[model samples]
Target: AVLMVGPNFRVGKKIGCFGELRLGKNLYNNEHVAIKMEPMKSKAPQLHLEYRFYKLLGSHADNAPDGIPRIYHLGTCGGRYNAMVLELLGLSLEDLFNICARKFSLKTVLMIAKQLLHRIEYVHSRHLIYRDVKPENFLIGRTSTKREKIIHIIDFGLAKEYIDLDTNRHIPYREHKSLTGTARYMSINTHMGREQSRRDDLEALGHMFMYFLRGSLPWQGLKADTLKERYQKIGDTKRATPIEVLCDGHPEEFATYLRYVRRLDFFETPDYDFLRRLFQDLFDRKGYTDEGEFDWTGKT
Candidate 1:
């Protein structure tokens, strides 16, 4: 079904589906955008909640924090769909992972590691926890210039406010809840039903980095008749696998990253700089420079 915005914004073909993203153009501004819409009757709407997050994250600022996307409009179009217009982004890390043949060079991985930490730190500071962290959630800019290298994080449908902004108090820990994120990247604690926090976000990010280095994870492709069984198996394998085993054949810093995140208290404030420094030190020891290069950047 086609969705028509105002006379100036033309919504076109469906391009994605976190909640049905349509490629749209601003006739007056002459720029492309991704218009995310959900059915007005949705019992559990996400675009409105996601839009609330963007506003909390300062999307309106000229110098917004690194990975937050620019949100332009939010409204229900003629009582048919709840729509949000946002700046269009380039390919996600998942797409780039396949394009680069699944494995990224260590230099590229470390460069990405630094940025991901920065992104999560800002989100955590805003009292939010991005329960989902995977390749698909991170995207690069659409431009060919320097902006293309900056990774932007999207999809906050699963995100939660971990702190009471007014009270300045952390949320109490709880358990026995269904998993809230992708099983492949969620932490063992989360698998055990512990409430997700900043630590879980960092741990999930660590799993993604490890995937980049190894090209695959130990728990991937497990077989089961039900998703419940498959998730149980993945968690079991993940629990059984030691940090040394997971970080084997790679730098010790990777193992250090995982171990540190796993040991954090439920409400502890992580030392973001210290965690970032681990990879930064590794990058320096290997004599790498911030030349702003990635696996897919081409001269042509």
Candidate 2:
């Protein structure tokens, strides 16, 4: 379904659906790229918003935060669609899950947790928050050996600034808002219609880790006639599941993380160092080294 080909690049087969991720390549450098396009007349055009986010983060070469994919180009194509070409990445954590037999070893989870925390921490530091924190949004690099071990955070369509740029203040707490991310990984507060903040991002990451280790979330298969009912059921199941039970069979650090993030004030700055050290200590005690190796490597 790819139809646009310019002087600088050539579009290939469709590889993904969200925004029609067609595989493409930069002609000058012969680099592989992922192309996302949307109709110009659509009610909400996400690519432009997403592009500004990357632009706001500044350049990767000039000390921009890691884990964000490099944006190569943004333009209108054939007068019909808005398009963006970005660095192509490898399998997402969700894709890697099945490849690794639906399980991630504690060592791998710890390794990933550090980067995940670092990524979110930096984004928060810059005054913006990534509302969608899920495995599908985190991906490994495909082009180089060094990059193969690096986790890149993608999809900024749901991201927004939490601080007022001119006033230098946090957003006021609000309620009765629709859910912004995948229900399986969202925080309880988000399900309760609370305004999402930095805390919500960390809380969602906590659930992501549990899902990675356990291979499934408790509310994954809840059935309902309507979407609203299904979300309500999932939220109910998530709330009823205690932190202790949710993190059962895993290290105590996992539970501690959930408790800490859930208890944070709306505008409180999370103790990023403490959380990193919490997992780093466990990784150290487990006799794991930062060898840049993961379960998928032997199997990839």
RMSD, each candidate, Å? 1.9, 1.8
Off by over 4 Å in 2: 1-6, 60-64, 143-145
Residue-level lDDT of model 1, residues 12-126, one tens digit each, is 8888754688899888888887888888888877778888888889896254666778887776665578888888888888998999988999999999999988988889888
**Model 1's lDDT to the true fold?**
0.86
TM-score of each: 0.95, 0.95
Scored against the true structure, residue 36 in model 1 reaches a CA lDDT of 87
- Residue 58 of model 1 has an lDDT of 83
Which stretches in model 1 have alpha-carbon errors above 4 Å?
61-63, 144-146
Candidate 2, residues 1-300: lDDT per residue as tens digits? 345656786788889874678889777888777888888888866888888888877634235456788777787677687888777889899899989988999999999999989988878877788998889989998846368888988889899899887878898888998788999899999999999999999999999999999989989889888999988999888889999998889899999999999999988999999999999999999999898889998667
Q: What is the RMSD of candidate 1? A: 1.9
State the displacement of the C-alpha of residue 215, model 1, in Å, after optimal TM-score superposition: 1.0
